[PDB]
Structure 1
Amino acid sequence: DLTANLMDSVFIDSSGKKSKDKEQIKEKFRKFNEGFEDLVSKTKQYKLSDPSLKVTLKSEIISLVMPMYERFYSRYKDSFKNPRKHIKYTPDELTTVLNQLVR
């Protein structure tokens, strides 16, 4: 769902200009962070027992998320002098979050 309406949020505003609709910047990127930390939050409820299930769900959801944020992060990282105040994560640090989502 997160990846779904993320790249759908790319799709619906794929029509016009660069995001002078900065509600689209903080729409896609803020609500992406919202649902991302919702998913990390409810990931904490469950603690796995098979190590290969840890590898499995880990690399599955990594392969689900990443290239969207690669082409999309890297597509839209050119909007402010501090995108920091609108966009939060690298793929480096988000990758690290996923890699310590799986303790």
Structure 2
Amino acid sequence: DLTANLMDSVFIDSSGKKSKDKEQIKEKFRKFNEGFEDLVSKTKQYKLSDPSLKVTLKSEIISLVMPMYERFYSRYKDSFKNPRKHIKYTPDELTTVLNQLVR
């Protein structure tokens, strides 16, 4: 769902200009962070027992998320002098979050 309406949020505003609709910047990127930390939050409820399930769900959801944020992060990282105040994560640090989502 997160990846779904993330790249759908790319799709619906794929029509016009660069995001002078900065509600689209903080729409896609803020609500992406919202649902991302919702998913990390409810990931904490469950603690796995098979190590190969840890590898499995780990690399599955990594392969689900990443290239969207690669082409999309890297597509839209050119909007402010501090995108920091609108966009939060690298793929480096988000990758690290996923890699310590799986303790």
TM-score when normalising by structure 2: 1.00
CA displacement 1:20-72 (0-9 Å, x = unmatched): 00000000000000000000000000000000000000000000000000000
Q: What is the RMSD computed on CA atoms of the aligned residues? A: 0.0
4+ residue segments displaced more than 6 Å: none
Q: Identity, % of aligned pairs?
A: 100
Q: Aligned residue for 1:43?
A: 43
d(CA) in 2 for partners of 1:100, 1:14:
34
In the TM superposition, residue 94 of structure 1 has moved relative to its aligned partner by: 0.0
d(CA) in 2 for partners of 1:41, 1:32:
14
Give the secondary-structure state (helix, strand or coil) at the position aligned to 2:81: coil
TM-score when normalising by structure 1: 1.00
Aligned length: 103
| Structure 1 segments unaligned to the other structure (5+ residues) | none
